[PDB]
Protein backbone atom coordinates (compact mmCIF):
# COMPACT_ATOMS: atom_id res chain seq x y z
CA UNK A 1 0.00 0.00 0.00
CA UNK A 2 2.73 2.44 1.11
CA UNK A 3 6.42 2.19 2.12
CA UNK A 4 7.00 0.40 5.49
CA UNK A 5 9.28 3.34 6.53
CA UNK A 6 6.94 5.09 8.98
CA UNK A 7 3.13 5.04 8.55
CA UNK A 8 1.48 8.40 7.76
CA UNK A 9 -0.63 10.78 9.95
CA UNK A 10 -1.63 14.50 9.97
CA UNK A 11 -0.05 16.74 12.64
CA UNK A 12 -3.29 18.80 13.14
CA UNK A 13 -5.05 15.39 13.77
CA UNK A 14 -2.29 13.75 15.96
CA UNK A 15 -2.41 16.86 18.26
CA UNK A 16 -6.26 16.42 18.47
CA UNK A 17 -5.85 12.69 19.48
CA UNK A 18 -3.58 13.84 22.40
CA UNK A 19 -5.88 16.76 23.53
CA UNK A 20 -8.81 14.24 23.88
CA UNK A 21 -6.79 11.58 25.85
CA UNK A 22 -5.72 13.95 28.73
CA UNK A 23 -8.92 16.13 28.91
CA UNK A 24 -11.33 13.18 28.40
CA UNK A 25 -13.58 12.20 25.43
CA UNK A 26 -15.61 15.17 24.08
CA UNK A 27 -18.15 15.58 21.17
CA UNK A 28 -17.38 14.20 17.56
CA UNK A 29 -13.82 15.22 16.43
CA UNK A 30 -14.42 17.36 13.26
CA UNK A 31 -11.52 16.26 10.94
CA UNK A 32 -10.98 16.36 7.12
CA UNK A 33 -7.88 14.07 7.10
CA UNK A 34 -8.94 10.87 5.27
CA UNK A 35 -5.39 9.84 4.22
CA UNK A 36 -4.19 9.03 7.81
CA UNK A 37 -3.58 5.43 9.06
CA UNK A 38 -5.35 4.56 12.41
CA UNK A 39 -3.06 4.06 15.46
CA UNK A 40 -3.83 2.10 18.71
CA UNK A 41 -3.83 5.43 20.66
CA UNK A 42 -7.22 6.30 18.98
CA UNK A 43 -9.45 3.29 20.04
CA UNK A 44 -12.53 4.55 21.94
CA UNK A 45 -12.84 8.01 20.32
CA UNK A 46 -15.44 9.55 17.95
CA UNK A 47 -13.59 10.93 14.86
CA UNK A 48 -15.95 12.80 12.49
CA UNK A 49 -14.38 12.03 9.03
CA UNK A 50 -15.38 14.05 5.88
CA UNK A 51 -16.97 12.33 2.78
CA UNK A 52 -17.27 15.46 0.61
CA UNK A 53 -20.19 17.30 2.32
CA UNK A 54 -20.80 15.90 5.87
CA UNK A 55 -18.74 14.50 8.80
CA UNK A 56 -19.36 10.70 9.24
CA UNK A 57 -18.81 10.10 13.04
CA UNK A 58 -17.01 6.72 13.36
CA UNK A 59 -16.38 5.19 16.86
CA UNK A 60 -12.78 3.82 16.82
CA UNK A 61 -12.20 0.06 17.40
CA UNK A 62 -9.08 -2.19 17.74
CA UNK A 63 -9.76 -3.84 14.33
CA UNK A 64 -9.77 -0.36 12.63
CA UNK A 65 -5.95 -0.05 13.36
CA UNK A 66 -3.84 -0.20 10.16
CA UNK A 67 -6.61 1.03 7.79
CA UNK A 68 -7.32 4.62 6.60
CA UNK A 69 -10.04 6.87 8.14
CA UNK A 70 -11.41 7.34 4.58
CA UNK A 71 -12.69 3.75 4.36
CA UNK A 72 -15.44 4.31 6.99
CA UNK A 73 -16.89 7.46 5.31
CA UNK A 74 -18.95 6.79 2.10
CA UNK A 75 -18.11 9.17 -0.81
CA UNK A 76 -20.61 8.10 -3.55
CA UNK A 77 -24.38 7.98 -2.70
CA UNK A 78 -25.86 5.02 -4.67
CA UNK A 79 -29.64 4.32 -4.31
CA UNK B 1 -8.25 -5.17 -61.25
CA UNK B 2 -10.81 -2.91 -63.01
CA UNK B 3 -8.46 -1.43 -65.65
CA UNK B 4 -5.08 -2.85 -64.38
CA UNK B 5 -4.43 -6.30 -66.02
CA UNK B 6 -1.70 -7.74 -63.72
CA UNK B 7 -0.04 -11.18 -64.07
CA UNK B 8 1.06 -13.57 -61.29
CA UNK B 9 4.04 -13.70 -58.91
CA UNK B 10 6.54 -16.46 -59.78
CA UNK B 11 7.53 -17.90 -56.37
CA UNK B 12 10.86 -19.65 -55.48
CA UNK B 13 10.85 -23.52 -55.65
CA UNK B 14 10.90 -25.86 -52.57
CA UNK B 15 14.17 -25.99 -50.46
CA UNK B 16 14.18 -29.86 -50.49
CA UNK B 17 12.79 -31.44 -53.77
CA UNK B 18 12.55 -28.19 -55.81
CA UNK B 19 8.77 -28.33 -56.44
CA UNK B 20 6.92 -25.07 -57.27
CA UNK B 21 3.60 -26.81 -56.44
CA UNK B 22 4.99 -27.66 -52.94
CA UNK B 23 6.28 -24.07 -52.55
CA UNK B 24 2.65 -22.93 -53.07
CA UNK B 25 1.48 -25.72 -50.67
CA UNK B 26 3.84 -24.60 -47.81
CA UNK B 27 2.65 -20.94 -48.16
CA UNK B 28 -1.02 -22.08 -48.05
CA UNK B 29 -0.46 -23.88 -44.68
CA UNK B 30 1.84 -21.02 -43.43
CA UNK B 31 0.26 -18.98 -40.63
CA UNK B 32 1.49 -15.69 -38.99
CA UNK B 33 4.34 -15.55 -41.61
CA UNK B 34 6.07 -18.46 -39.77
CA UNK B 35 7.49 -20.21 -42.91
CA UNK B 36 9.95 -22.32 -40.79
CA UNK B 37 7.27 -24.08 -38.58
CA UNK B 38 5.18 -24.33 -41.82
CA UNK B 39 7.65 -26.33 -43.97
CA UNK B 40 8.53 -28.36 -40.80
CA UNK B 41 4.85 -29.61 -40.64
CA UNK B 42 4.63 -30.13 -44.47
CA UNK B 43 7.79 -32.34 -44.44
CA UNK B 44 6.80 -34.27 -41.19
CA UNK B 45 3.36 -35.04 -42.76
CA UNK B 46 5.12 -36.03 -46.08
CA UNK B 47 7.51 -38.33 -44.10
CA UNK B 48 4.60 -40.03 -42.22
CA UNK B 49 2.51 -40.23 -45.49
CA UNK B 50 5.00 -41.68 -48.06
CA UNK B 51 6.19 -44.33 -45.48
CA UNK B 52 2.56 -45.33 -44.57
CA UNK B 53 1.51 -45.45 -48.34
CA UNK B 54 4.64 -46.84 -50.07
CA UNK B 55 7.37 -44.15 -50.56
CA UNK B 56 7.31 -41.89 -53.77
CA UNK B 57 6.79 -38.55 -51.83
CA UNK B 58 6.22 -36.50 -55.08
CA UNK B 59 3.61 -39.07 -56.34
CA UNK B 60 1.95 -39.52 -52.83
CA UNK B 61 0.98 -35.79 -53.04
CA UNK B 62 -0.12 -36.00 -56.76
CA UNK B 63 -2.45 -39.06 -56.14
CA UNK B 64 -4.44 -37.26 -53.36
CA UNK B 65 -4.45 -34.04 -55.52
CA UNK B 66 -6.28 -35.52 -58.60
CA UNK B 67 -9.24 -36.56 -56.35
CA UNK B 68 -9.70 -32.95 -54.99
CA UNK B 69 -8.91 -31.09 -58.31
CA UNK B 70 -12.28 -29.70 -59.60
CA UNK B 71 -13.34 -29.13 -63.23
CA UNK B 72 -16.37 -26.72 -63.06
CA UNK B 73 -17.61 -24.13 -60.50
CA UNK B 74 -20.43 -21.54 -60.07
CA UNK B 75 -20.17 -17.69 -60.44
CA UNK B 76 -22.79 -15.70 -58.43
CA UNK B 77 -24.07 -13.07 -60.92
CA UNK B 78 -27.12 -10.73 -60.44
CA UNK B 79 -29.00 -9.95 -63.71
CA UNK B 80 -32.59 -8.92 -62.82
CA UNK B 81 -32.81 -8.59 -59.04
CA UNK B 82 -32.44 -12.41 -58.86
CA UNK B 83 -29.01 -14.08 -58.27
CA UNK B 84 -27.99 -16.68 -60.91
CA UNK B 85 -25.22 -19.29 -60.30
CA UNK B 86 -23.51 -19.64 -63.73
CA UNK B 87 -21.26 -22.71 -64.38
CA UNK B 88 -17.71 -21.75 -65.52
CA UNK B 89 -14.79 -24.07 -66.46
CA UNK B 90 -11.88 -23.60 -64.00
CA UNK B 91 -8.26 -22.90 -65.21
CA UNK B 92 -5.26 -25.32 -64.57
CA UNK B 93 -3.47 -22.88 -62.17
CA UNK B 94 -6.65 -22.33 -60.04
CA UNK B 95 -7.46 -26.07 -60.32
CA UNK B 96 -4.33 -26.92 -58.23
CA UNK B 97 -4.71 -23.80 -55.99
CA UNK B 98 -8.32 -24.75 -54.99
CA UNK B 99 -7.36 -28.41 -54.36
CA UNK B 100 -4.43 -27.44 -52.03
CA UNK B 101 -6.68 -24.90 -50.19
CA UNK B 102 -9.37 -27.42 -49.09
CA UNK B 103 -6.75 -30.05 -48.04
CA UNK B 104 -5.41 -27.53 -45.43
CA UNK B 105 -8.94 -26.30 -44.38
CA UNK B 106 -10.17 -29.88 -43.77
CA UNK B 107 -6.96 -30.84 -41.83
CA UNK B 108 -7.41 -27.80 -39.50
CA UNK B 109 -11.04 -28.93 -38.80
CA UNK B 110 -9.77 -32.46 -37.77
CA UNK B 111 -9.47 -33.72 -34.13
CA UNK B 112 -6.00 -35.39 -34.22
CA UNK B 113 -3.02 -34.72 -31.81
CA UNK B 114 -0.77 -32.67 -34.19
CA UNK B 115 -0.78 -30.84 -37.62
CA UNK B 116 1.79 -33.37 -38.96
CA UNK B 117 -0.90 -36.05 -38.12
CA UNK B 118 -3.92 -33.86 -39.22
CA UNK B 119 -2.32 -33.20 -42.67
CA UNK B 120 -1.15 -36.80 -43.27
CA UNK B 121 -4.56 -38.46 -42.41
CA UNK B 122 -6.40 -35.92 -44.64
CA UNK B 123 -3.91 -36.64 -47.52
CA UNK B 124 -4.57 -40.38 -46.91
CA UNK B 125 -8.41 -39.85 -46.97
CA UNK B 126 -8.12 -37.81 -50.23
CA UNK B 127 -5.89 -40.48 -51.92
CA UNK B 128 -8.75 -43.05 -51.37
CA UNK B 129 -11.35 -40.15 -51.84
CA UNK B 130 -13.31 -40.40 -48.50
CA UNK B 131 -12.48 -37.16 -46.54
CA UNK B 132 -13.91 -33.64 -45.89
CA UNK B 133 -11.84 -32.21 -48.83
CA UNK B 134 -13.20 -34.59 -51.54
CA UNK B 135 -16.75 -33.72 -50.24
CA UNK B 136 -15.89 -29.98 -50.74
CA UNK B 137 -15.13 -30.85 -54.43
CA UNK B 138 -18.43 -32.84 -54.57
CA UNK B 139 -20.70 -29.98 -53.24
CA UNK B 140 -19.04 -27.79 -55.99
CA UNK B 141 -20.02 -30.46 -58.56
CA UNK B 142 -23.68 -30.88 -57.38
CA UNK B 143 -24.05 -27.05 -57.71
CA UNK B 144 -22.47 -26.97 -61.21
CA UNK B 145 -24.56 -29.90 -62.61
CA UNK B 146 -27.80 -28.36 -61.22
CA UNK B 147 -27.43 -24.85 -62.73
CA UNK B 148 -26.29 -26.58 -66.03
CA UNK B 149 -29.11 -24.77 -67.95
CA UNK B 150 -27.46 -21.30 -67.43
CA UNK B 151 -24.18 -22.36 -69.17
CA UNK C 1 48.89 17.57 -27.77
CA UNK C 2 45.67 17.52 -29.92
CA UNK C 3 42.81 20.03 -30.33
CA UNK C 4 39.36 18.45 -30.93
CA UNK C 5 36.74 20.73 -32.56
CA UNK C 6 33.13 19.46 -32.59
CA UNK C 7 30.79 21.42 -34.89
CA UNK C 8 26.95 21.30 -34.38
CA UNK C 9 24.48 23.19 -36.67
CA UNK C 10 20.83 22.78 -37.75
CA UNK C 11 21.81 23.79 -41.35
CA UNK C 12 24.08 21.43 -43.38
CA UNK C 13 25.35 24.01 -45.97
CA UNK C 14 26.37 26.21 -43.02
CA UNK C 15 28.34 23.54 -41.08
CA UNK C 16 30.72 22.54 -43.94
CA UNK C 17 31.16 26.27 -44.97
CA UNK C 18 32.39 27.04 -41.41
CA UNK C 19 34.29 23.66 -41.37
CA UNK C 20 36.16 24.76 -44.56
CA UNK C 21 37.07 27.98 -42.64
CA UNK C 22 38.56 25.89 -39.76
CA UNK C 23 40.33 23.37 -42.06
CA UNK C 24 41.78 25.95 -44.57
CA UNK C 25 43.00 28.43 -41.82
CA UNK C 26 44.73 25.55 -39.93
CA UNK C 27 46.47 23.99 -43.00
CA UNK C 28 47.47 27.56 -44.21
CA UNK C 29 49.13 28.38 -40.85
CA UNK C 30 50.93 24.99 -41.06
CA UNK C 31 49.33 22.33 -38.86
CA UNK C 32 48.54 18.60 -39.08
CA UNK C 33 44.77 18.54 -39.96
CA UNK C 34 42.72 15.28 -39.66
CA UNK C 35 39.15 15.30 -41.02
CA UNK C 36 36.48 16.97 -41.73
CA UNK C 37 34.86 13.82 -40.26
CA UNK C 38 31.05 13.67 -40.85
CA UNK C 39 29.51 12.27 -37.64
CA UNK C 40 25.89 10.85 -37.71
CA UNK C 41 23.07 13.48 -37.80
CA UNK C 42 20.56 13.29 -34.92
CA UNK C 43 16.95 13.49 -36.28
CA UNK C 44 14.56 14.68 -33.53
CA UNK C 45 11.07 14.02 -34.97
CA UNK C 46 7.82 15.66 -33.69
CA UNK C 47 4.16 14.77 -34.40
CA UNK C 48 1.49 17.39 -33.48
CA UNK C 49 -2.32 17.57 -33.97
CA UNK C 50 -3.00 20.15 -36.70
CA UNK C 51 -6.70 20.84 -35.56
CA UNK C 52 -7.58 23.02 -32.49
CA UNK C 53 -10.24 20.50 -31.35
CA UNK C 54 -10.87 16.76 -32.28
CA UNK C 55 -9.55 15.19 -35.65
CA UNK C 56 -6.99 12.65 -34.29
CA UNK C 57 -5.80 11.61 -37.79
CA UNK C 58 -5.20 15.26 -38.87
CA UNK C 59 -1.47 15.66 -38.01
CA UNK C 60 1.80 17.51 -38.85
CA UNK C 61 5.17 15.68 -38.73
CA UNK C 62 8.34 17.82 -38.24
CA UNK C 63 12.08 17.17 -37.74
CA UNK C 64 15.09 19.08 -36.35
CA UNK C 65 18.28 17.85 -38.12
CA UNK C 66 21.36 18.33 -35.85
CA UNK C 67 24.39 17.97 -38.24
CA UNK C 68 27.82 17.00 -36.79
CA UNK C 69 31.39 17.69 -38.03
CA UNK C 70 34.67 16.66 -36.37
CA UNK C 71 37.97 18.43 -37.14
CA UNK C 72 41.12 17.09 -35.37
CA UNK C 73 44.23 19.35 -35.44
CA UNK C 74 47.42 17.45 -34.33
CA UNK C 75 49.94 20.37 -34.31
CA UNK C 76 49.11 23.08 -31.71
CA UNK C 77 51.44 25.73 -33.30
CA UNK C 78 51.25 29.31 -31.90
CA UNK C 79 50.69 30.45 -35.56
CA UNK C 80 47.71 27.97 -35.71
CA UNK C 81 46.13 28.35 -32.17
CA UNK C 82 46.04 32.20 -32.51
CA UNK C 83 44.74 32.26 -36.14
CA UNK C 84 41.79 29.95 -35.24
CA UNK C 85 40.85 31.87 -32.06
CA UNK C 86 40.48 35.14 -34.05
CA UNK C 87 38.23 33.42 -36.68
CA UNK C 88 34.73 34.84 -37.19
CA UNK C 89 32.36 31.88 -37.64
CA UNK C 90 28.56 31.67 -38.24
CA UNK C 91 26.29 32.40 -35.20
CA UNK C 92 24.16 29.36 -36.10
CA UNK C 93 27.12 26.95 -35.59
CA UNK C 94 28.13 25.68 -32.12
CA UNK C 95 31.86 25.10 -31.64
CA UNK C 96 33.07 22.77 -28.86
CA UNK C 97 36.84 22.83 -28.09
CA UNK C 98 38.36 19.72 -26.46
CA UNK C 99 41.97 19.97 -25.11
Amino acid sequence: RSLKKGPFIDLHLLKKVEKAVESGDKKPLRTWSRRSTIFPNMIGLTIAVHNGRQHVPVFVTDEMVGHKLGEFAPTRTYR
Amino acid sequence: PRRRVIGQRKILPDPKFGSELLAKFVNILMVDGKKSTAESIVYSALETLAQRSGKSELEAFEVALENVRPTVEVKSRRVGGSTYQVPVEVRPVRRNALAMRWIVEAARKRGDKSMALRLANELSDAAENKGTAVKKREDVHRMAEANKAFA
Amino acid sequence: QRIRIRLKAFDHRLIDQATAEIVETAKRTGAQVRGPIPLPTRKERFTVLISPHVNKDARDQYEIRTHLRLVDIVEPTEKTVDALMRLDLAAGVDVQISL
Binding site: - | - | K8, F10, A91, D94
Partner: protein, 206 residues
Protein backbone atom coordinates in the same frame (compact mmCIF):
# COMPACT_ATOMS: atom_id res chain seq x y z
CA UNK D 1 -9.78 22.03 -48.81
CA UNK D 2 -7.03 23.04 -46.37
CA UNK D 3 -3.82 24.61 -47.65
CA UNK D 4 -0.26 24.23 -46.31
CA UNK D 5 1.47 27.39 -45.02
CA UNK D 6 3.33 28.83 -48.07
CA UNK D 7 6.34 30.00 -45.97
CA UNK D 8 6.52 26.83 -43.75
CA UNK D 9 6.61 24.47 -46.74
CA UNK D 10 9.38 26.50 -48.48
CA UNK D 11 11.66 26.66 -45.34
CA UNK D 12 14.92 25.15 -46.55
CA UNK D 13 13.81 25.02 -50.22
CA UNK D 14 13.72 28.78 -51.20
CA UNK D 15 12.74 30.40 -47.88
CA UNK D 16 14.85 31.29 -44.80
CA UNK D 17 14.11 31.06 -41.07
CA UNK D 18 13.44 34.09 -38.75
CA UNK D 19 15.44 32.38 -35.98
CA UNK D 20 18.83 31.03 -37.17
CA UNK D 21 20.39 30.31 -33.71
CA UNK D 22 21.31 26.87 -32.34
CA UNK D 23 20.58 25.52 -28.83
CA UNK D 24 20.31 22.14 -27.06
CA UNK D 25 17.01 20.90 -25.41
CA UNK D 26 18.22 22.65 -22.14
CA UNK D 27 17.79 26.27 -23.34
CA UNK D 28 15.83 25.82 -26.67
CA UNK D 29 12.46 26.55 -24.93
CA UNK D 30 13.82 29.53 -22.84
CA UNK D 31 15.26 31.10 -26.06
CA UNK D 32 11.94 30.65 -27.96
CA UNK D 33 10.04 32.47 -25.12
CA UNK D 34 12.72 35.24 -25.13
CA UNK D 35 12.42 35.45 -28.99
CA UNK D 36 8.59 35.74 -28.84
CA UNK D 37 8.96 38.29 -25.96
CA UNK D 38 11.43 40.51 -27.99
CA UNK D 39 9.37 40.32 -31.26
CA UNK D 40 6.20 41.18 -29.25
CA UNK D 41 7.94 44.32 -27.81
CA UNK D 42 9.33 45.47 -31.19
CA UNK D 43 6.01 45.13 -33.13
CA UNK D 44 4.22 47.11 -30.36
CA UNK D 45 6.78 49.97 -30.32
CA UNK D 46 7.63 50.15 -34.08
CA UNK D 47 3.90 49.88 -35.00
CA UNK D 48 3.76 52.92 -37.36
CA UNK D 49 7.40 52.16 -38.45
CA UNK D 50 6.49 49.54 -41.19
CA UNK D 51 8.33 46.43 -39.81
CA UNK D 52 7.97 43.39 -42.17
CA UNK D 53 10.33 40.76 -40.69
CA UNK D 54 12.40 40.43 -37.51
CA UNK D 55 15.37 37.99 -37.64
CA UNK D 56 16.86 36.71 -34.34
CA UNK D 57 20.33 35.11 -34.21
CA UNK D 58 22.23 34.31 -30.99
CA UNK D 59 26.03 34.66 -31.40
CA UNK D 60 27.52 33.14 -28.15
CA UNK D 61 25.96 34.67 -24.99
CA UNK D 62 24.52 37.59 -27.10
CA UNK D 63 21.44 38.49 -29.25
CA UNK D 64 21.55 40.05 -32.77
CA UNK D 65 18.14 41.43 -33.95
CA UNK D 66 17.82 42.35 -37.66
CA UNK D 67 14.71 44.56 -38.10
CA UNK D 68 13.49 44.58 -41.75
CA UNK D 69 11.74 47.93 -42.25
CA UNK D 70 10.60 50.09 -45.18
CA UNK D 71 10.91 53.18 -42.92
CA UNK D 72 14.49 52.92 -41.38
CA UNK D 73 14.71 56.65 -40.68
CA UNK D 74 11.89 56.50 -38.09
CA UNK D 75 13.26 53.21 -36.50
CA UNK D 76 16.78 54.76 -36.08
CA UNK D 77 15.62 58.34 -35.28
CA UNK D 78 18.01 61.29 -34.65
CA UNK D 79 21.49 59.62 -34.71
CA UNK D 80 20.75 56.30 -32.86
CA UNK D 81 18.36 58.07 -30.40
CA UNK D 82 15.63 55.40 -31.02
CA UNK D 83 18.01 52.43 -31.66
CA UNK D 84 19.74 52.85 -28.24
CA UNK D 85 16.40 52.98 -26.29
CA UNK D 86 15.22 49.77 -28.10
CA UNK D 87 18.57 47.87 -27.65
CA UNK D 88 18.66 48.77 -23.90
CA UNK D 89 15.31 46.98 -23.24
CA UNK D 90 16.00 44.11 -25.78
CA UNK D 91 18.97 43.27 -23.48
CA UNK D 92 16.59 43.53 -20.42
CA UNK D 93 14.03 41.15 -22.04
CA UNK D 94 16.78 38.71 -23.26
CA UNK D 95 19.12 38.98 -20.22
CA UNK D 96 22.24 38.91 -22.46
CA UNK D 97 23.92 41.89 -24.36
CA UNK D 98 21.93 43.20 -27.35
CA UNK D 99 22.87 44.44 -30.88
CA UNK D 100 20.15 45.77 -33.23
CA UNK D 101 20.80 45.88 -37.03
CA UNK D 102 18.38 47.55 -39.48
CA UNK D 103 17.69 46.03 -42.95
CA UNK D 104 16.02 48.20 -45.61
CA UNK D 105 12.81 47.14 -47.38
CA UNK D 106 13.23 48.81 -50.84
CA UNK D 107 9.88 48.03 -52.59
CA UNK D 108 7.31 47.64 -49.71
CA UNK D 109 4.42 47.14 -52.21
CA UNK D 110 6.10 43.74 -52.84
CA UNK D 111 6.28 42.66 -49.15
CA UNK D 112 3.50 40.32 -47.91
CA UNK D 113 3.48 41.44 -44.21
CA UNK D 114 3.55 45.14 -45.30
CA UNK D 115 0.78 44.84 -47.96
CA UNK D 116 -1.25 42.85 -45.34
CA UNK D 117 -0.67 45.40 -42.50
CA UNK D 118 -1.64 48.20 -44.94
CA UNK D 119 -5.02 46.55 -45.84
CA UNK D 120 -5.58 45.82 -42.08
CA UNK D 121 -4.88 49.51 -41.15
CA UNK D 122 -7.12 50.79 -44.00
CA UNK D 123 -10.15 48.72 -42.86
CA UNK D 124 -9.68 50.09 -39.31
CA UNK D 125 -9.78 53.61 -40.94
CA UNK D 126 -13.31 52.66 -42.30
CA UNK D 127 -12.10 52.48 -45.97
CA UNK D 128 -13.90 50.16 -48.46
CA UNK D 129 -12.40 46.63 -48.57
CA UNK D 130 -12.83 46.22 -52.37
CA UNK D 131 -10.80 49.48 -52.91
CA UNK D 132 -8.05 48.34 -50.46
CA UNK D 133 -7.75 44.95 -52.26
CA UNK D 134 -7.70 46.46 -55.79
CA UNK D 135 -5.13 49.16 -54.77
CA UNK D 136 -2.92 46.46 -53.17
CA UNK D 137 -3.02 44.22 -56.29
CA UNK D 138 -2.55 47.15 -58.78
CA UNK D 139 0.47 48.66 -56.90
CA UNK D 140 2.15 45.23 -56.61
CA UNK D 141 1.66 44.30 -60.33
CA UNK D 142 3.03 47.60 -61.79
CA UNK D 143 6.07 47.33 -59.45
CA UNK D 144 7.15 43.98 -60.93
CA UNK D 145 5.19 41.24 -59.10
CA UNK D 146 4.77 38.18 -61.37
CA UNK D 147 1.52 37.58 -59.48
CA UNK D 148 -0.51 38.55 -56.37
CA UNK D 149 -3.54 37.09 -54.47
CA UNK D 150 -5.28 38.96 -51.59
CA UNK D 151 -8.06 37.48 -49.39
CA UNK D 152 -10.25 39.27 -46.79
CA UNK D 153 -12.47 37.17 -44.45
CA UNK D 154 -15.50 37.71 -42.18
CA UNK D 155 -18.21 40.42 -41.69
CA UNK D 156 -16.98 42.48 -44.68
CA UNK D 157 -18.19 46.05 -44.28
CA UNK D 158 -20.02 45.31 -41.01
CA UNK D 159 -22.28 42.67 -42.70
CA UNK D 160 -24.38 40.24 -40.59
CA UNK D 161 -23.30 37.20 -42.69
CA UNK D 162 -19.53 36.71 -43.08
CA UNK D 163 -17.99 36.33 -46.52
CA UNK D 164 -14.50 35.50 -47.77
CA UNK D 165 -13.71 37.74 -50.80
CA UNK D 166 -10.48 37.43 -52.87
CA UNK D 167 -8.77 39.17 -55.82
CA UNK D 168 -5.98 37.73 -58.03
CA UNK D 169 -3.76 38.90 -60.92
CA UNK D 170 -0.94 37.02 -62.58
CA UNK D 171 0.57 33.59 -61.80
CA UNK D 172 0.54 32.16 -58.21
CA UNK D 173 2.00 28.55 -58.42
CA UNK D 174 1.33 27.52 -54.77
CA UNK D 175 2.41 23.91 -55.58
CA UNK D 176 5.84 24.66 -57.10
CA UNK D 177 8.32 24.51 -54.11
CA UNK D 178 10.86 26.33 -56.39
CA UNK D 179 8.53 29.45 -56.53
CA UNK D 180 9.22 32.62 -54.47
CA UNK D 181 5.85 32.87 -52.69
CA UNK D 182 5.95 35.56 -50.01
CA UNK D 183 2.96 34.98 -47.69
CA UNK D 184 1.68 36.81 -44.65
CA UNK D 185 -1.38 37.41 -42.46
CA UNK D 186 -2.80 40.51 -40.71
CA UNK D 187 -5.94 41.06 -38.57
CA UNK D 188 -8.14 44.16 -38.78
CA UNK D 189 -9.78 44.60 -35.35
CA UNK D 190 -12.98 46.46 -36.35
CA UNK D 191 -16.12 47.83 -34.67
CA UNK D 192 -18.04 44.72 -35.86
CA UNK D 193 -15.41 42.03 -35.33
CA UNK D 194 -12.17 40.59 -36.76
CA UNK D 195 -11.28 40.73 -40.51
CA UNK D 196 -8.44 38.43 -41.59
CA UNK D 197 -6.19 39.57 -44.48
CA UNK D 198 -4.06 36.94 -46.37
CA UNK D 199 -1.58 38.05 -49.06
CA UNK D 200 0.40 35.90 -51.58
CA UNK D 201 3.07 37.58 -53.79
CA UNK D 202 4.78 35.53 -56.54
CA UNK D 203 8.23 37.01 -57.27
CA UNK D 204 9.52 34.39 -59.78
CA UNK D 205 10.91 30.86 -59.90
CA UNK D 206 14.26 29.41 -58.49
Amino acid sequence: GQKVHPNGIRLGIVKPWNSTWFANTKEFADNLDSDFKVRQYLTKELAKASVSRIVIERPAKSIRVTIHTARPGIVIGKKGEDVEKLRKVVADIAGVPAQINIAEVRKPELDAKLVADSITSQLERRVMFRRAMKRAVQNAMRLGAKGIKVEVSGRLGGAEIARTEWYREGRVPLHTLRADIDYNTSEAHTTYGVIGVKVWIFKGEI
